[PDB]
Amino acid sequence: TYTVSENKRFLLKDGKPFFWLGDTAWELFHRLDREDADYYLKKRAAQKYTVIQAVALAEFDGLNVPNPYGDKPLLNNDPTTPNDAYFKHVDFIIDKAAEYGLTIGFLPTWGDKLNKSTWGKGPEVFNTNNARIYGKWLANRYKNKKNIIWILGGDRTPRPNSDDVKVWRAMAAGIVEGVGGNDKALITFHPQPNKEGASQWFHADEWFDFNMFQNGHCRDTPIYDNIKGSYDRALVKPVIDGEPIYEDHPVCFNATDLGISNAYDVRKYAYLNLFAGAFGHTYGCHDIWQMYSPFREAVNGPNFYWQQAMELPGAKQMQHARKLIESRPFLDRVPDQSLVVENNSPASERIQATRGKDYAFIYSAAGKSFTVNLGKISGTQLNAYWFDPRNGKVEDISKIDNTYKFTPPRSGYGQDWVLILDDAS
């Protein structure tokens, strides 16, 4: 179903351009019964999402705390012997998401089942032997599903001088064996924050189909450099932010001094990642991924129970980013910072520009004015517009000869605007 584009910068769904729009639902299989999961999936489909990242061996004591129907995932906590009773619910949620046109970003396991670290519950069960057997059992079970994109890892940097990299590579094999070829599965890796993303360990790996980042969860960080670093690699492979700052998440993991994120944050992450080269974007909400509920232990102070948190504003605004990207020639899009004079503004007021051949999007993060170099896209005249990332509306500026300074309608904190340039022909 899912392949890399011919230009090796985007993903396809049955040959056609596929826009990755993700919601982060780590504990979906772990904490949502059949009625809950139908409720969550039907709503997210209405909001124009396409990817749902979820974890089979969840983070919240995923092995020893059973799913809503009382079943644990691994018989004797042994990865070589998964519990078919638990994965019957995994089958249900995968098939339900397919009914809503939703692709599951499937994480075979959270990282704490390999490396607990100081905060993980674990217990650690994976080695280089059972990871492959585990990966094969999953790949053989779902080799005929058409709405699965595989996601190894889970918030754990491979420990130096360890078997961690080997374990993930062994799990990638067996997955590839289970489905029957590198072509029969799309696979990436979810990392902890770093400067190279998952590509730090797996970029040259034949099974590694596209790089993924965890940019965040801070404010004013130059996330465009992280995307650019993977885009400018001589080995061309697509790139995406698999975990930006979450809505209703403590800023920089420091709520005491810095409080809680806002919708402006999730929009800045979404547009800066996309305009720097990302083929899509995964949205996340602190309340959603952990499925915040009064009857289950939470972490890191979520504020909205998950049914309400689905209606948060940042969740509702990602469809505007989807609408914007799909309006113009998809495969021709490229990051081009030479499109403006102020190509290296600070993150808080970043001017980030993307373009194809007959169009150009330029994101002004704090609504500051920018001057655009006009020798860059085709045409002798160019249409100009403003696109409101909060509501998705568009307003006309003028038609300009193809060097020119533009001013967003408003400027200041929360006044992010994107300029739409179009070949008049």
SS3 39: helix
Range of the domain at 397: 336-423
- Asked if residue 292 and residue 231 are part of one domain, the reply reads yes
Torsion of CA 200, 204, 210, 215, to 10 degrees: 10
**Residue 141, both tokens:** 């079970």
Structural contact between residues 94 and 42, judged by C-beta atoms closer than 8 angstroms = no
Spatial separation of the C-alpha atoms in residues 296 and 293, rounded to whole Å? 6
In the structure encoding, which two tokens stand for residue 330, read together?
């998809």
Q: Which of 88, 179, 190 is nearest to 137 (CA)?
A: 179
Same domain, 68 and 197: yes
Method: X-ray
| Cβ-based neighbours of 27, under 8 Å, separated by 6 or more | 54, 55, 58, 59, 60, 289, 290, 291
Classified as helix, coil or strand, 323 is helix
Residues 259 and 288 in one domain: yes
Q: Is the CB of residue 286 less than 8 Å from the CB of residue 246?
A: yes
Same domain, 224 and 169: yes
Amino acid at position 225, single letter: D
Q: Structure tokens of 322? A: 């989807």
- How far apart are alpha carbons 425 and 136 in whole angstroms? 52
CA distances from 200 to 105, 190, 337 (A): 21, 12, 25
Residue 402, Cβ density class (10 Å: 0-12 exposed, 13-18 middle, ≥19 buried)? middle
Indicate the number of domains in the chain: 2
Report the residue numbers after which the chain has a gap, meaning the C atom sits over 2.5 angstroms from the next written residue's N, or none: 402
Q: Quick one: DSSP state of residue 366? A: T
DSSP state string for 9-27: SSEEETTEE---EEEE-TT
The reply to whether 322 and 341 lie within a common domain is no
Q: Which residues contact 12 (CB under 8 A, 6 or more apart)?
A: 2, 3, 4, 5, 18
Q: Which helix (H) or strand (E) holds 398?
A: strand 394-401
315 shares a domain with 401: no
In the Cβ-directed half-sphere of 300, how many Cα atoms lie within 13 Å? 23
Reported resolution in A? 2.2
